[PDB]
Amino acid sequence: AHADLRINSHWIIPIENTVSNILIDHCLLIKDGIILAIEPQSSCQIPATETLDLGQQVLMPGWVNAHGHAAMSLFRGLADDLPLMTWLQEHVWPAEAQHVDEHFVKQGTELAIAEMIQSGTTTFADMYFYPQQSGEAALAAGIRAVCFAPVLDFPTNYAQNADEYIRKAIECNDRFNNHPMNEQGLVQIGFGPHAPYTVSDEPLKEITMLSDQLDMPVQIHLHETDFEVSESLETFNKRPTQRLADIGFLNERVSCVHMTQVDDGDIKILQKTGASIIHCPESNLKLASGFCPIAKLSAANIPLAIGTDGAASNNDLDMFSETKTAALLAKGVSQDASAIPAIEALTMATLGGARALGIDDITGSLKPGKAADIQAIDLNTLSSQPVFDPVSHMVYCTKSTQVSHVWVNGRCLLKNGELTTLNEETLINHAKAWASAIRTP
Amino acid sequence: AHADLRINSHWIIPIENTVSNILIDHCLLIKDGIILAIEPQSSCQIPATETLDLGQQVLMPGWVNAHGHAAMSLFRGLADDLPLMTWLQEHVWPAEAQHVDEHFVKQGTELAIAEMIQSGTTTFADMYFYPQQSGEAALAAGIRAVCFAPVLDFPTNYAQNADEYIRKAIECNDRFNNHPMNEQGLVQIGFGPHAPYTVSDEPLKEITMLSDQLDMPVQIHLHETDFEVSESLETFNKRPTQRLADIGFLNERVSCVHMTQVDDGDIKILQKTGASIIHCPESNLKLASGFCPIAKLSAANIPLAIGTDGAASNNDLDMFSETKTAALLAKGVSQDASAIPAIEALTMATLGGARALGIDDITGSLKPGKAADIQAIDLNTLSSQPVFDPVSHMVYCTKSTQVSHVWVNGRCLLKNGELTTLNEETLINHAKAWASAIRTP
Numbered sequence: 056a057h058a059d060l061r062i063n064s065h066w067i068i069p070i071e072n073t074v075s076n077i078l079i080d081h082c083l084l085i086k087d088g089i090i091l092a093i094e095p096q097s098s099c100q101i102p103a104t105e106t107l108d109l110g111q112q113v114l115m116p117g118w119v120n121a122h123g124h125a126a127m128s129l130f131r132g133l134a135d136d137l138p139l140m141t142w143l144q145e146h147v148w149p150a151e152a153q154h155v156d157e158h159f160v161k162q163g164t165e166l167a168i169a170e171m172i173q174s175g176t177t178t179f180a181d182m183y184f185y186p187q188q189s190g191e192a193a194l195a196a197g198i199r200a201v202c203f204a205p206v207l208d209f210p211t212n213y214a215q216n217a218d219e220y221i222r223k224a225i226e227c228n229d230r231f232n233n234h235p236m237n238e239q240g241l242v243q244i245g246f247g248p249h250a251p252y253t254v255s256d257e258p259l260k261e262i263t264m265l266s267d268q269l270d271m272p273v274q275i276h277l278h279e280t281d282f283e284v285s286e287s288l289e290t291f292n293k294r295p296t297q298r299l300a301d302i303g304f305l306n307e308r309v310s311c312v313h314m315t316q317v318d319d320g321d322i323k324i325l326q327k328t329g330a331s332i333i334h335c336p337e338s339n340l341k342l343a344s345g346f347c348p349i350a351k352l353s354a355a356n357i358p359l360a361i362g363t364d365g366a367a368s369n370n371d372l373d374m375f376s377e378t379k380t381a382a383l384l385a386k387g388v389s390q391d392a393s394a395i396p397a398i399e400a401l402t403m404a405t406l407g408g409a410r411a412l413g414i415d416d417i418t419g420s421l422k423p424g425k426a427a428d429i430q431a432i433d434l435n436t437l438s439s440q441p442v443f444d445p446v447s448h449m450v451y452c453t454k455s456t457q458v459s460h461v462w463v464n465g466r467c468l469l470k471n472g473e474l475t476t477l478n479e480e481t482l483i484n485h486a487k488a489w490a491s492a493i494r495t496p
Numbered sequence: 497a498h499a500d501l502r503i504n505s506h507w508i509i510p511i512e513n514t515v516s517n518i519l520i521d522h523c524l525l526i527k528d529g530i531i532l533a534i535e536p537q538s539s540c541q542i543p544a545t546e547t548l549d550l551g552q553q554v555l556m557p558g559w560v561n562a563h564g565h566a567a568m569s570l571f572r573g574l575a576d577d578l579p580l581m582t583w584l585q586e587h588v589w590p591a592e593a594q595h596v597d598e599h600f601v602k603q604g605t606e607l608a609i610a611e612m613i614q615s616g617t618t619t620f621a622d623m624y625f626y627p628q629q630s631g632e633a634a635l636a637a638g639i640r641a642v643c644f645a646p647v648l649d650f651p652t653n654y655a656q657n658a659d660e661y662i663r664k665a666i667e668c669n670d671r672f673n674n675h676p677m678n679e680q681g682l683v684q685i686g687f688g689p690h691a692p693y694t695v696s697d698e699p700l701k702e703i704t705m706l707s708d709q710l711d712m713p714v715q716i717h718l719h720e721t722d723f724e725v726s727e728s729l730e731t732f733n734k735r736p737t738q739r740l741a742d743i744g745f746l747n748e749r750v751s752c753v754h755m756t757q758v759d760d761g762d763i764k765i766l767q768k769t770g771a772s773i774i775h776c777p778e779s780n781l782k783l784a785s786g787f788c789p790i791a792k793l794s795a796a797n798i799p800l801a802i803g804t805d806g807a808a809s810n811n812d813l814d815m816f817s818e819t820k821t822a823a824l825l826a827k828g829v830s831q832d833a834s835a836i837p838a839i840e841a842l843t844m845a846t847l848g849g850a851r852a853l854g855i856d857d858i859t860g861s862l863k864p865g866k867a868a869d870i871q872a873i874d875l876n877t878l879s880s881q882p883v884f885d886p887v888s889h890m891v892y893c894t895k896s897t898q899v900s901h902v903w904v905n906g907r908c909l910l911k912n913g914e915l916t917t918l919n920e921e922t923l924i925n926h927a928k929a930w931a932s933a934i935r936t937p
């Protein structure tokens with residue numbers, strides 16, 4: 056048959072229309088990992104090799120988790136309820152210096168990926184050590200990934216200095232351009248300078264040039280805390296946004312994480328440079344970083360996305376919960392019950408992330424021609440019934456465990472709630488082994 | 497055997513110690529619905545008729561959902577993303593006037609109860625029409641309930657005026673004191689005056705007298721919105737807290753819901769009168785009501801509890817998610833990452849609710865002599881591994897679907913994730929029937 060797979064579902068939320076936000080009794084037709092068409096089930100005349108009848112479920116794009124540190128799944132809830140400073144100095148940094156190597160990153164990324172697939176995520180962004188390990192795990196699992204190879208001014212086990220961080224990013228990009236398993240381009244490598252206060256101007260400019268030459272996305276923290284903004288004003292006499300804008304670092308391919316400290320000048324700079332904002336509400340709350348004013352940013356037409364951050368400051372990788380927090384918090388922050396309606400929250404969590412990571416041409420919404428990165432959510436459960444508008448249900452009363460199926464590039468990674476490329480029992484054993492090693496070395 | 501049931505579990509979080517917040521390899525012994533003892537498994541010499549081996553699970557008190565409207569499960573996500581005023585006038589109130597009767601409340605409460613049990617809740621507070629229907633559903637399900645019979649100044653189908661609302665509350669209390677199925681006292685009736693701006697001084701004073709004479713708890717909204725506080729200042733020249741204090745309405749048996757508008761005078765009044773505060777973070781965010789400063793309230797030793805509110809402004813009844821929101825939001829609001837640590841969030845969500853509803857003598861913590869209201873949470877799942885401190889995991893990375901077992905008064909209401917006194921498929925059919933009736937009458 057022309058189509059590999061036909062999926063029938065009562066509801067489809069395409070995110071991009073091709074003027075209601077939802078389609079009733081349509082089907083998706085997929086071929087070679089690509090969406091061929093979305094059409095009414097009754098009218099459809101495209102035969103399919105295989106057909107799946109989902110019934111009372113919602114099909115929508117898989118989530119794009121636009122900021123994370125996948126391998127830190129192995130530090131899940133390592134040290135909760137402590138100030139950023141104690142958390143970092145007495146727990147996270149020693150644990151990183153002692154435990155994080157290629158094996159840690161491999162097993163941690165596998166664990167994260169399995170959690171993410173089970174909660175409907177089809178693309179993750181990763182900013183962490185040993186990105187080749189992370190990228191390789193993504194390849195074996197079949198999940199789409201953007202690994203923002205870290206760049207820092209300071210030495211770690213992974214690299215001694217900015218130039219070495221950059222070298223390894225270039226090497227990793229080259230390795231994935233040429234990897235036998237990566238012909239489909241599921242894994243992209245980018246540059247992940249941590250933050251303006253940990254990376255100097257020179258490496259940042261190198262990143263800009265290299266990012267352009269090698270077609271790589273860039274991610275950086277921006278205005279995460281009042282402290283970082285004050286520090287920048289003391290040291291550079293500029294807000295970080297201004298510093299980055301003045302050296303030409305900010306542009307469309309850059310995503311700026313957090314942005315809890317926002318003034319009108321920041322917004323103008325963001326509008327000018329075309330950069331995206333990645334919202335991480337739960338992590339911002341948990342660490343007391345502040346309140347990203349996504350309502351205000353949205354009204355200013357700033358591109359917005361959503362990330363969970365890492366499992367040591369969340370502590371899960373559940374985009375259903377993160378998107379719900381984003382939609383609820385925004386109404387409180389803006390004092391406006393109509394701010395960030397459900398369709399907008401879903402859009403941030405899918406197409407917004409795709410745009411932020413530079414991959415919206417291929418994924419992030421259900422449009423003919425885009426990749427078949429799809430999640431199916433089963434609504435026939437007590438906590439989801441009755442349903443009046445499935446779009447708002449997705450955001451306000453859906454558990455991630457309702458995800459029944461997941462496809463990436465048209466490949467089934469989750470079938471009736473069960474992982475198809477990862478072994479849950481094995482991953483859990485490895486997690487427990489690492490916990491013991493971390494707990495009592 | 498002396499004990500009816502022995503439950504073995506790797507972790508027990510008793511909430512009240514009898515100085516670590518958790519017990520390793522202990523067991524719970526239950527007899528006649530009562531906790532006989534909590535002892536090390538190895539040392540235990542109390543035989544039991546039946547023994548359950550749970551392994552890597554946490555036993556803790558079932559949640560006390562201290563404010564809700566159970567039957568509004570049938571309005572789940574009725575009209576999302578609208579301002580309080582449109583929400584009420586164009587959606588909720590017409591739907592209530594048209595659909596809410598004894599049959600609505602029966603089937604809605606059953607649906608809510610099933611959702612709540614599946615997410616580990618063992619006591620719910622309800623403030624809604626036809627409390628006898630709600631109470632009767634609680635009795636048949638086996639869940640503990642406090643039904644705060646509504647009192648209002650204005651006419652509804654349920655009652656024409658304050659005196660009639662009060663009459664029906666008295667009748668309902670009497671009916672449950674004498675109900676053949678209620679000998680164990682699972683169901684308590686209370687008074688639920690909606691808010692200072694919908695109930696006059698006279699009925700409020702009657703409630704105080706009757707509450708005392710009949711040993712009934714009282715629940716009221718207090719300082720939910722800036723509008724209500726301003727309105728009270730115009731009309732009475734007092735903050736609502738002051739109005740209620742001056743007529744002697746506030747006392748230990750009263751729970752005050754929301755409290756997003758707080759000044760130092762409010763706190764003093766609350767400290768003086770001994771009343772409890774019920775925190776409903778997601779509903780407050782969703783409707784843009786404001787930010788209850790639970791960190792500040794906690795530091796002032798004000799008794800605190802947690803509620804989900806109703807399914808039209810949440811939109812689920814999941815106390816795992818609500819407690820996590822409470823713990824996270826509080827750090828952001830107070831700008832203090834150490835504020836409302838996990839053990840304190842759990843305590844609010846269990847013992848805090850018990851105290852608020854006047855039932856802490858019998859439930860809310862795992863102490864010898866208290867009721868066996870218990871939930872078991874399975875940690876052997878991908879998203880919960882690894883685990884370093886189960887207490888903080890409960891709050892920061894646990895899904896409600898991890899609840900494997902639930903007991904109320906030592907009766908199993910949920911066995912391996914399956915309801916034992918309610919039929920899930922039936923409830924869902926009824927929910928869909930009501931949705932159709934509500935959607936297209």
Ligand SMILES: [Ca+2]
Pocket residue numbers: 123124364365
């Ligand atoms: Ca981060």
Ligand SMILES: [Ca+2]
Pocket residue numbers: 337369370371372373376377892
């Ligand atoms: Ca989370």
Ligand SMILES: [Ca+2]
Pocket residue numbers: 564565805806
């Ligand atoms: Ca309410």
Ligand SMILES: [Ca+2]
Pocket residue numbers: 451778810811812813814817818
């Ligand atoms: Ca909720």
